[PDB]
């Protein structure tokens, strides 16, 4: 009597992912009080208006 | 943030110099010798606004 077995497994995983997130803004003011200019031109990203 | 608040211009002509600059000029040698004009620039610099 004689017996043989062979067993083989191969498994592969590959994963990938990317983000690009660009934000730009350029508020511009002429006239009025310099403090109001600077305070308002400063970009409140939550309220760009 | 670039904030601009006032525009200045000097008159083109008949400027009234500062005493100190006036005198230092008065003491400049009539013959060229670099050392004195060098000291002049090191005191007052090279240009005016």
Swiss-Prot record, chain A:
Quaternary context: Monomer or dimer; as a C5b-7 complex it can also form multimeric rosettes. Component of the membrane attack complex (MAC), composed of complement C5b, C6, C7, C8A, C8B, C8G and multiple copies of the pore-forming subunit C9.
Function: Component of the membrane attack complex (MAC), a multiprotein complex activated by the complement cascade, which inserts into a target cell membrane and forms a pore, leading to target cell membrane rupture and cell lysis. The MAC is initiated by proteolytic cleavage of C5 into complement C5b in response to the classical, alternative, lectin and GZMK complement pathways. The complement pathways consist in a cascade of proteins that leads to phagocytosis and breakdown of pathogens and signaling that strengthens the adaptive immune system. C7 serves as a membrane anchor.
Pathological association: Complement component 7 deficiency: A rare defect of the complement classical pathway associated with susceptibility to severe recurrent infections, predominantly by Neisseria gonorrhoeae or Neisseria meningitidis.
Protein name (Swiss-Prot/TrEMBL): Complement component C7
Organism of origin: Homo sapiens
Effect of substituting residue 41 to T: Confirmed at protein level
Coiled coil segments of this chain: none
Record family assignment: Belongs to the complement C6/C7/C8/C9 family.
UniProtKB/Swiss-Prot annotation, chain B:
Disorder: Complement component 8 deficiency, 2: A rare defect of the complement classical pathway associated with susceptibility to severe recurrent infections, predominantly by Neisseria gonorrhoeae or Neisseria meningitidis.
Protein name (record): Complement component C8 beta chain
PTM comment text: N-glycosylated; contains one or two bound glycans. Not O-glycosylated.
Quaternary organization: Heterotrimer of 3 chains: alpha (C8A), beta (C8B) and gamma (C8G); the alpha and gamma chains are disulfide bonded. Component of the membrane attack complex (MAC), composed of complement C5b, C6, C7, C8A, C8B, C8G and multiple copies of the pore-forming subunit C9.
Parent-protein residues present: 297 to 345 of 591
UniProt similarity note: Belongs to the complement C6/C7/C8/C9 family.
Physiological role: Component of the membrane attack complex (MAC), a multiprotein complex activated by the complement cascade, which inserts into a target cell membrane and forms a pore, leading to target cell membrane rupture and cell lysis. The MAC is initiated by proteolytic cleavage of C5 into complement C5b in response to the classical, alternative, lectin and GZMK complement pathways. The complement pathways consist in a cascade of proteins that leads to phagocytosis and breakdown of pathogens and signaling that strengthens the adaptive immune system.
Compartmental location: Secreted; Target cell membrane
